[PDB]
């Protein structure tokens, strides 16, 4: 189970069932993605597979990443949000991640958009 | 003479004593002190447990009864309880009494 609040006593938060055994959670640096690290029972086996599930702040599921090893222990994003380090069974994997930017190109102008610290 | 604090559905009430007729009462914006104004022209400040921590007297005493006081709402806590969407309520057979 997962629960995303607007503030510490938001009594109508976003509700999520991830369907997996969770080990930890992390926002990206921009606060636009939540990563959830865990493992799920594999579909034809009495064996668990490690997964990271990515969520919007509003609880829509962006994707799932598998990782090889006995267990995923822990999770952390790079300061740029372009890599995420996955501590797994005496290894660190790094998932590259390609943001779904609010952007487009029109007549030799690039349009790019970003949230601000101060607006 | 007496002001009776209690927290939701506990079995008892702190009927705590005062020097004077207790005209008006207001909680601090963070909830941690209950301030009381007196007909004796004193305001005094009590913690959430009922111990008395601070006093001020209006110069003249009972010449100037304190008929109301209010803590300013202007701090981070005003949005606390500003997020609810519960669609149902509690229900009970008949009205009970709370002791002491």
Swiss-Prot record, chain A:
- Look up the domain of life of the source: Eukaryota
Signal peptide, first to last residue: none
Q: Where in the cell is it found?
A: Cytoplasm, Cytoskeleton, Microtubule organizing center, Centrosome; Cytoplasm, Cytoskeleton, Cilium axoneme; Cytoplasm, Cytoskeleton, Cilium basal body
Q: What is the effect of changing residue 77 to L?
A: In SRTD7 and SRTD7/20; the SRTD7/20 patient also carries variant INTU 276-Q--L-942 del; chondrocyte cell lines from a patient show a reduction of cilia indicating a defect in ciliogenesis
WD repeat ranges, renumbered to this chain: 12-54
Q: What induces it?
A: By TNF.
Clinical note on disease? Cranioectodermal dysplasia 2: A disorder characterized by craniofacial, skeletal and ectodermal abnormalities. Clinical features include short stature, dolichocephaly, craniosynostosis, narrow thorax with pectus excavatum, short limbs, brachydactyly, joint laxity, narrow palpebral fissures, telecanthus with hypertelorism, low-set simple ears, everted lower lip, and short neck. Teeth abnormalities include widely spaced, hypoplastic and fused teeth. Short-rib thoracic dysplasia 7 with or without polydactyly: A form of short-rib thoracic dysplasia, a group of autosomal recessive ciliopathies that are characterized by a constricted thoracic cage, short ribs, shortened tubular bones, and a 'trident' appearance of the acetabular roof. Polydactyly is variably present. Non-skeletal involvement can include cleft lip/palate as well as anomalies of major organs such as the brain, eye, heart, kidneys, liver, pancreas, intestines, and genitalia.
Q: What task does this protein carry out?
A: As a component of the IFT complex A (IFT-A), a complex required for retrograde ciliary transport and entry into cilia of G protein-coupled receptors (GPCRs), it is involved in ciliogenesis and ciliary protein trafficking. May promote CASP3 activation and TNF-stimulated apoptosis.
Q: How does it assemble?
A: Component of the IFT complex A (IFT-A) complex. IFT-A complex is divided into a core subcomplex composed of IFT122:IFT140:WDR19 which is associated with TULP3 and a peripheral subcomplex composed of IFT43:WDR35:TTC21B. Interacts directy with IFT122, ITF43 and TTC21B. Interacts with IFT43. Interacts with CFAP61.
Entry protein name: WD repeat-containing protein 35
From which source organism is this entry?
A: Homo sapiens (Human)
Q: Which residues of the full protein are shown?
A: 235 to 353 of 1181
UniProtKB/Swiss-Prot annotation, chain B:
Could you tell me which residues the WD repeats occupy? 18-56
Which superkingdom is the protein from?
Answer: Eukaryota
Question: Where is it made, tissue-wise?
Answer: Expressed in many tissues. Predominant expression in testis and pituitary.
The subcellular localization recorded is:
Cell projection, Cilium; Cytoplasm, Cytoskeleton, Cilium basal body
* Subunit structure, interactors included: Component of the IFT complex A (IFT-A) complex. IFT-A complex is divided into a core subcomplex composed of IFT122:IFT140:WDR19 which is associated with TULP3 and a peripheral subcomplex composed of IFT43:WDR35:TTC21B. Interacts with IFT43:WDR35; the interaction connects the 2 IFT-A subcomplexes. Interacts with IFTAP; the interaction associates IFTAP with IFT-A complex.
Comment block on domains: Forms the trimeric core subcomplex IFT122:IFT140:WDR19 via the C-terminal region, whereas it interacts with IFT43:WDR35 via the N-terminal region containing the WD repeats.
What does this protein's UniProt record list under function?
As a component of the IFT complex A (IFT-A), a complex required for retrograde ciliary transport and entry into cilia of G protein-coupled receptors (GPCRs), it is required in ciliogenesis and ciliary protein trafficking. Involved in cilia formation during neuronal patterning. Acts as a negative regulator of Shh signaling. Required to recruit TULP3 to primary cilia.
Q: Which disease is it linked to?
A: Cranioectodermal dysplasia 1: A disorder characterized by craniofacial, skeletal and ectodermal abnormalities. Clinical features include dolichocephaly (with or without sagittal suture synostosis), scaphocephaly, short stature, limb shortening, short ribs, narrow chest, brachydactyly, renal failure and hepatic fibrosis, small and abnormally shaped teeth, sparse hair, skin laxity and abnormal nails.
* Protein name as annotated: Intraflagellar transport protein 122 homolog
Question: What gene does this protein come from?
Answer: IFT122
Q: Give the fragment's position in the full-length protein.
A: 114 to 213 of 1241
